[PDB]
């Protein structure tokens, strides 16, 4: 995990070039690249606090997409202005196999819109709950993709801050695509916002300490646990009870967890930041070289050459049978511009 021969130089050169591409778009973001009338709105794929994600059809090409719609007035009430500007500026700038692609973005009097690739295989969440738990090889396959994705994101000084099965989509090749960058932030050094999802919060977030990218590696610990066990390492009926368990310093593993898996998780679900994997001298390499990952070919994962554990059912284009049904609502567009100044850069 400490060795710096030639494989680490290939990684470095890849990341150097990736940062070059990212910064060009970070500094000159794409803006106003489509219009609502160019899309036919089909079905709601999911919901969130300030809006919904809808399956749409692009009229000129006939391509399907997932369009995230945010009500500007609701974003403001929930004080998510800057986070929403973060989300779009970051998503239009990144490029990685396991990140959902932003194809267009635009706004009107009422809403903000982010039009992303449609990922037809459904949320990992749906599959995980239905099957119960994933086998360790199954969980390892998904986990490896998140490891490379965080290596990418962190090298760009990004923190993701909302890892959970609800935000991971399975594509037609059986690989992962990360969605929802609502809390992603570009920051060098500490930040302090209390945000994320209760089950996945690192102790330092709960305790208002100021934190960094190590919270993503803690969340990875939670994700792997939840994939392999079928339930999260810290659960209860109320968030406050969840936080008490998280800060307590105690975790217990199912008896079917392998010795290697438990050792990896003890190092990820580590309250002591000076000991948490991903946050040490060797960076992500402490994770990549842990023997739970000994069978993982990292390059093969990146190239999508590894055989996926399962391939979602696909009933032709536009099919949503891998997604839950949601109540449909009208996209109303006011005749007056709302919150113009606040979202001018969107």
């Amino acid at each position: 995990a400490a060795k710096k021969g030639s494989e680490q130089e290939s990684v470095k050169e890849f990341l150097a070039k990736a940062k070059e591409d990212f910064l060009k778009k970070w500094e000159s973001p794409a803006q106003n690249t489509a219009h609502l009338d160019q899309f036919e709105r089909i079905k709601t794929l999911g919901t969130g606090s300030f809006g919904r994600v809808m399956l749409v059809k692009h009229k000129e090409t006939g391509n399907h997409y997932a369009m995230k719609i945010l009500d500007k007035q609701k974003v403001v009430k929930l004080k998510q202005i800057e986070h929403t500007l973060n989300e779009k500026r970051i998503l239009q700038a990144v490029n990685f196999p396991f990140l959902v692609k932003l194809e267009f973005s635009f706004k009107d009097n009422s809403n903000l819109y982010m039009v992303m690739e449609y990922v037809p295989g459904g949320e990992m969440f749906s599959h995980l709950r239905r099957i119960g738990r994933f086998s360790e090889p199954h969980a390892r396959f998904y986990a490896a993709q998140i490891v490379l994705t965080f290596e990418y994101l962190h090298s760009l000084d990004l923190i993701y801050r909302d890892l959970k099965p609800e935000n991971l989509l399975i594509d037609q090749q059986g690989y992962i695509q990360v969605t929802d960058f609502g809390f992603a932030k570009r920051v060098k050094g500490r930040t302090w916002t209390l945000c994320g999802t209760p089950e996945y919060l690192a102790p330092e977030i709960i305790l208002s300490k100021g934190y960094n990218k190590a919270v993503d590696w803690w969340a990875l610990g939670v994700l792997i646990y939840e994939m392999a066990a079928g339930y999260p390492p810290f659960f209860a009926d109320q968030p406050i009870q969840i936080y008490e368990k998280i800060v307590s310093g105690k975790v217990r593993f199912p008896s079917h967890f392998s010795s290697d898996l438990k050792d990896l998780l003890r190092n990820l679900l580590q309250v002591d930041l000076t000991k948490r994997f991903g946050n040490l001298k060797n960076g992500v390499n402490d994770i990549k070289n842990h023997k739970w990952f000994a069978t993982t070919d990292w390059i093969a994962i990146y190239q999508r050459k590894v055989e996926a554990p399962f391939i979602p059912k696909f009933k032709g284009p536009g099919d949503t049978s891998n997604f839950d049904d949601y109540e449909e609502e009208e996209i109303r567009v006011s005749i007056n511009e709302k919150c113009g100044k606040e979202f001018s850069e969107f």
Partner: peptide, 20 residues
């Protein structure tokens, strides 16, 4: 079992993000 305890809990559905 821990699994049964999870399944009977109020948080097996989609979990919302928190803020503030």
């Amino acid at each position: 079992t821990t699994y049964a305890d999870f399944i009977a809990s109020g948080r097996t559905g989609r979990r919302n993000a928190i803020h503030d």
